[PDB]
């Protein structure tokens, strides 16, 4: 298996003014991602509001990404839902698409209470797309707080198509144990963009995140600086990352990140309820503060 | 408006050995509930595993309850889902049925961050079933930890069909503030069965819960004792309730509660993933310990 | 053993304008408590800011209460501190006083990680005052979240002078299991004043709390109403309790409760850092809102 | 001001078999720390069990470190206690010693509820040792979860001897905002040893921690490798760090870390209650697993 490298964007699902999926904007985001140096996409995940879409919408969205990317990006589709019936309907559909892997986030209502229980849930899902890899997505936001090192070690026995897990957590001690589980066999992309050089320094080889939708060249420059050992340059580039994150924290991560796509000529619309929309004034503020953060390049 | 009185069961969704909905067992549970002195049902809620079912299954389940109850019970249908599209499809369907009210539990992934935001989400839902009442279901398990007194006061302005909220929380200080919000206008059924006499004592008039599926006569006897001021009798009856709850805590609330339906000749099957099934040995243990708890009556 | 009955106040430690202990005001509070129908006191606890005082101050405070009460109240002294050396110095001193029992709250920094560990810590403390009873104080605020039923069952074996535990938690399911542990052997006073009728209804015989410092006659009237089965009267009296609690939540429980002592001609001063003082305007507001809550009696 | 550099050990307080302070072992630890390449010490902190010692013991301990270090290490004394009276008695004593700075951890029982409140508490403490620097110690274990960037910005106005804060938290996004607060003015040593290269990569210049008591040469080699950009070497050295941490998690951080001092001929004894002692078998296991982790050097 080849572990992912570089930046994996978790794209938005653009909604038009009637809160319907805007498929033409999905086409424009894919071209943008390819031009800005992203290597893969994780679709219908948290940033993608996949759980805000119906099964029918999710199936059309995953097909739209596969057509829009024209084989130039690795594609991972998140198929998780609270109902195993919906999840299995999405996962079976995903096994028919030209994609790299499926994935499921920890269920957030009845939360798996042990590693063994979580392994059984993931094994049922991964078996419905046995031709594709399978990533567990460890979320924090899910409330599923189980030992991920043990998850990889136990799931290795039970899930034949296991790829590894996406680590959306700041716990670098657990992350480094995951990197080493089963002699380093599994692929463990890191998922906290504002911690990126910290994860690089302890062994991350790829990162999945939402800011890569609009700041990928800037983060690729952090990766290159870190690699060259230019730690001064990593530091000054993270100053612009911290100003970006501040906009997300003030205005909402999905909402502000959607508006930030205007910096690349993309109209991603508002989020869906229960996420709230920004006002017309707030949208102008988001774009002005993202410009002031100074991470944009006038090129690809 | 007439506030609910007495016990409102949150019924299970029985699954057969292929994990499909068992509609004939729904018929048998409804007859049982009516015979055991339940006054209403809250369907497709947490105990009902509504979020484990697809939209199509949920619509068939709600119709099956309305046919099976033959107008003898008040029916509240929980229509909440993580996708507002699914929620609105269920809520519109529910507005066509002969039921009392719809309801939605706090979304557990992106959690409403203020009372105002939660009021906007509930107002969008309640407007899709404007002919029926609407209860918010306050869950704890949802992770949506906002001031429910303020929710009622703010939602009163914004939701014309607001009935009140179901209070699945042990916070009796917040519960009593809810009972009094807007001069006592709203209906606030209590939702923690093992605290029942405590909520009675501070003003509860009805309770919604899962143990009422199989212990309703016993809890109706607590209500009658409390009413008569026989606090000794309340105490000795709660000793049997505590032995019941211990079985739920040891073996899982949905799983053990489903097996307990065998005490009334009902085969409710296993839960769905991510909830795990009990072994054949554990199912025999659940039934023996529920018998030993001594809350069953050999009559209706 | 005779279980405590009625209201046990947790008195404040009055501080003068130099933040020194005001011993003469302790005398005035004791006379007040006896006149207002309190039956016991729990001194140097949370409301008492015992952990804000030095070992030397704490020893003088406990002696001042014993002199001021003139044998008319049962006295429990909280001797807990983060240092076992301080705790044991206080506990040994307390064994020499004419008091009913000592007590310790769960340590809040390194928190006992199992019931067994907590039993060993309490056994070491209770052995330093072997002539007096010993109550564990279960606090929530402590962060020590262990099964208190199991604590009583395990400590029964290990602590010869064990009296029971004071239950400052809203978990009525755990509270009722404590009431029944070892065939109902232990004394378990309830500790959430705004839940009082709820705990009465499930078996509480006494309650320890801070509002009893200034609202004892009103809560004694709730106890009498509940006993007579006058649930309407319990309800209308709890309306005044909820208006009292609102003042505590808005202005701080220790700070506002200290100012409320002005309603009984007592100058309890400000709290100590890290608790902040109220402004002169806020102190006038606290007293006006406590008057408006309408729980005061113009008599004893 | 010169920011700290390199490793700052948080030493243990050795206890003999009567649970008294072993002052002669303090002498031996200081010589060891100086020989193993530590640059400073943070005494009477969490690893030091300072809160388990009385005020009188704490004063003798701080004096013993100052005599034992013979001016070869920078010394920071943690003076925090739950009672401001104890804290101020310790802080005034510390102002008389030849040390670099005092420090206080967030109080864990009544927790400061705003940045402003925490600034007022720290300002009162730092003013009692106005000749020494002052570090706030941000702990997580304290439960004091306030914005530390805002703490530095607000405290800059109010505390004339403010040095900065010790950051015992894995939140690298907050840590990098602290590094930059007030144009990078404050000294912010990092406090999570198992995350060290991650904090290096985002700008840490020093680290305070307990593993530096017995693994300082190994972590100094990580610092040197990271500096040279040898990320392969950082990775393989962190494999030995993860095996060390596993021993702490299995057997208790203070208890196992005390036993690990046997690897340097130091008898640090057991912790004090409420921390539990290891059995004779467990102590042999701790030393065997710390040897197997392979981070020890047969030299200084």
Author numbering:
A (entry chain A), B (entry chain A), C (entry chain A), D (entry chain A): 1 to 300
Publication text:
A crystallization condition, composed of 25% PEG 1.5 K and 20% glycerol, produced diamond shaped crystals. The crystals diffracted up to 1.65 Å and belong to the orthorhombic space group I222 with cell parameters of 67 x 86 x 118 Å3. The whole amino acid sequence from residue 1 to 297 could be traced in the electron density maps. Three of the His residues from the tag were also visible in the electron density maps. Electron density clearly larger than water molecules was interpreted as glycerol and ethylene glycol originating from the crystallization conditions. There is one molecule in the asymmetric unit, but the crystallographic symmetry generates the functional tetrameric quaternary structure. The active sites are pointing inwards toward the center of a donut shaped tetramer. The corresponding residue in AsNAL is Asn168. This residue points towards the substrate and is positioned closer to the substrate than what is the case for Thr167 from EcNAL, or for an in silico mutation to threonine for AsNAL. Our structure of AsNAL shows that Asn168 is able to form two hydrogen bonds with substrates as ManNAc, Neu5Ac and Neu5Gc.
